[PDB]
Amino acid sequence: TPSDKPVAHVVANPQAEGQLQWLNRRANALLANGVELRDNQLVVPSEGLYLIYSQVLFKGQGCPSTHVLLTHTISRIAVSYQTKVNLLSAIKSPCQREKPWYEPIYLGGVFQLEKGDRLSAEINRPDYLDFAESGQVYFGIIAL
Amino acid sequence: TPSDKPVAHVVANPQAEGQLQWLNRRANALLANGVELRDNQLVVPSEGLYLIYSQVLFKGQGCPSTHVLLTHTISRIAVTKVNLLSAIKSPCQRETPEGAEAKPWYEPIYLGGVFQLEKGDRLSAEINRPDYLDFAESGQVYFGIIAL
Amino acid sequence: KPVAHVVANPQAEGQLQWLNRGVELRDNQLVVPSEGLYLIYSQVLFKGQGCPSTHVLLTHTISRIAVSYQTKVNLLSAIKSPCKPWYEPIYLGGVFQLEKGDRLSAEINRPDYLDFAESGQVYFGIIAL
Numbered sequence: 001t002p003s004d005k006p007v008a009h010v011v012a013n014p015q016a017e018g019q020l021q022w023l024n025r026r027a028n029a030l031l032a033n034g035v036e037l038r039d040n041q042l043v044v045p046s047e048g049l050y051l052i053y054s055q056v057l058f059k060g061q062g063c064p065s066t067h068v069l070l071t072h073t074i075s076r077i078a079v080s081y082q083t084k085v086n087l088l089s090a091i092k093s094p095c096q097r098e099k100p101w102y103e104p105i106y107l108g109g110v111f112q113l114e115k116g117d118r119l120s121a122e123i124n125r126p127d128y129l130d131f132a133e134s135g136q137v138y139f140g141i142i143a144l
Numbered sequence: 145t146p147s148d149k150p151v152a153h154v155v156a157n158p159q160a161e162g163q164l165q166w167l168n169r170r171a172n173a174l175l176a177n178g179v180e181l182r183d184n185q186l187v188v189p190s191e192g193l194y195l196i197y198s199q200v201l202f203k204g205q206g207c208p209s210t211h212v213l214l215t216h217t218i219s220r221i222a223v224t225k226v227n228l229l230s231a232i233k234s235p236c237q238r239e240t241p242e243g244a245e246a247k248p249w250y251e252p253i254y255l256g257g258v259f260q261l262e263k264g265d266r267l268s269a270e271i272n273r274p275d276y277l278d279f280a281e282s283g284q285v286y287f288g289i290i291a292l
Numbered sequence: 293k294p295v296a297h298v299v300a301n302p303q304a305e306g307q308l309q310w311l312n313r314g315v316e317l318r319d320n321q322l323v324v325p326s327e328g329l330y331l332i333y334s335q336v337l338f339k340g341q342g343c344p345s346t347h348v349l350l351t352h353t354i355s356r357i358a359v360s361y362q363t364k365v366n367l368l369s370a371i372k373s374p375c376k377p378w379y380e381p382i383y384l385g386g387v388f389q390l391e392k393g394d395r396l397s398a399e400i401n402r403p404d405y406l407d408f409a410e411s412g413q414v415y416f417g418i419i420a421l
């Protein structure tokens with residue numbers, strides 16, 4: 001008796017130059033029970049409470065120089081609306097003073113979502129993204 | 145609710161000056177399956193393992209000669225007061241000198257853990273310096289509980 | 293539905309050994325009782341009394357050993373560079389379609405840096421959806 005609960009766990013494309021592109025067409029990545037991936041967005045199949053999450057890993061070869069801001073945000077666009085309203089968001093400054101550094105950003109929470117809602121997981125600096133290993137950059141939803 | 149699991153995700157009031165006031169009667173904030181928000185606290189409706197989480201974002205326009213302390217704490221009140229999760233951050237490791245252009249700092253504090261909780265337990269997420277809270281965007285300051 | 297929430301052994305210092313209270317903990321790994329969707333999660337907490345000479349890398353990874361192909365694949369992984377006492381938590385969690393017999397491991401690279409002074413912060417679990 002499989003669960004008919006809308007789920008998604010999409011991973012970053014390690015090929016995408018200067019961007020964060022999500023894939024469902026990889027090992028241990030899924031899109032099930034009505035969830036779609038259109039224009040780098042997860043599309044909500046039906047109303048209900050959902051658990052929403054994302055992780056991104058940033059890496060830079062030494063802090064030198066100038067102050068860097070790393071944002072990671074999960075946004076929602078309701079049906080008939082156009083602008084992304086932020087659900088979860090984090091701003092990290094990895095530079096103390098101007099040796100490789102690492103900053104993981106984990107966002108997660110519970111949200112009531114509507115049919116046709118489009119969800120985005122975005123970063124401001126894809127030049128700092130790290131996908132050497134698997135499991136480092138992901139985005140998903142779990143229908144409760 | 146199909147998954148009758150007690151859940152909460154409350155958000156800071158960007159309007160409420162010098163304080164950290166939680167809201168649910170707002171867009172993209174909820175209380176479900178028995179969770180209540182009473183006197184800036186989430187009230188546990190039933191015994192169980194819960195995930196408790198909270199994020200706050202502090203921002204300051206340049207590090208003055210001051211050596212600031214930023215705390216964020218999640219506490220529990222049962223039918224008895226206990227500290228669950230706590231973090232203390234010092235954003236001024238090197239206080240900027242007189243003659244330098246003000247460089248804004250950022251310090252996010254995320255707290256989260258799994259705790260066995262009892263019916264009627266009251267959870268509070270508090271900070272020491274609400275004057276440093278950042279409301280430039282939404283999705284930055286929140287508090288929630290998910291029953292496992 | 294089947295569930296697990298294992299916690300670190302606070303006396304088993306120098307190792308990340310899970311303790312429990314059909315999700316069976318066998319050989320420090322979680323065994324998938326049946327086919328299906330699972331939520332997998334872990335939190336580890338690292339602590340160090342001032343930053344050392346060498347640049348330290350803290351990794352935390354959840355891996356799958358698929359019963360069918362007997363191979364080890366990272367499902368979720370993060371890496372942190374913490375370099376006065378410091379505290380660094382690492383959070384992992386996601387939904388995965390797993391098969392009966394599949395093994396799950398939650399591992400770290402530096403157990404010497406593991407803080408046992410908290411249990412509400414060092415756990416590993418699965419929840420069948």
Ligand SMILES: CC1(C)C(=O)c2ccccc2N1Cc1ccccc1OC(F)F
Binds near residue numbers: 051195258332383387
């Ligand atoms: C890793 C983290 C932050 C944790 O410590 C934890 C413990 C119990 C269950 C989930 C947990 N977390 C992830 C997580 C957080 C919020 C919403 C969904 C979500 O999970 C996703 F996987 F669905």
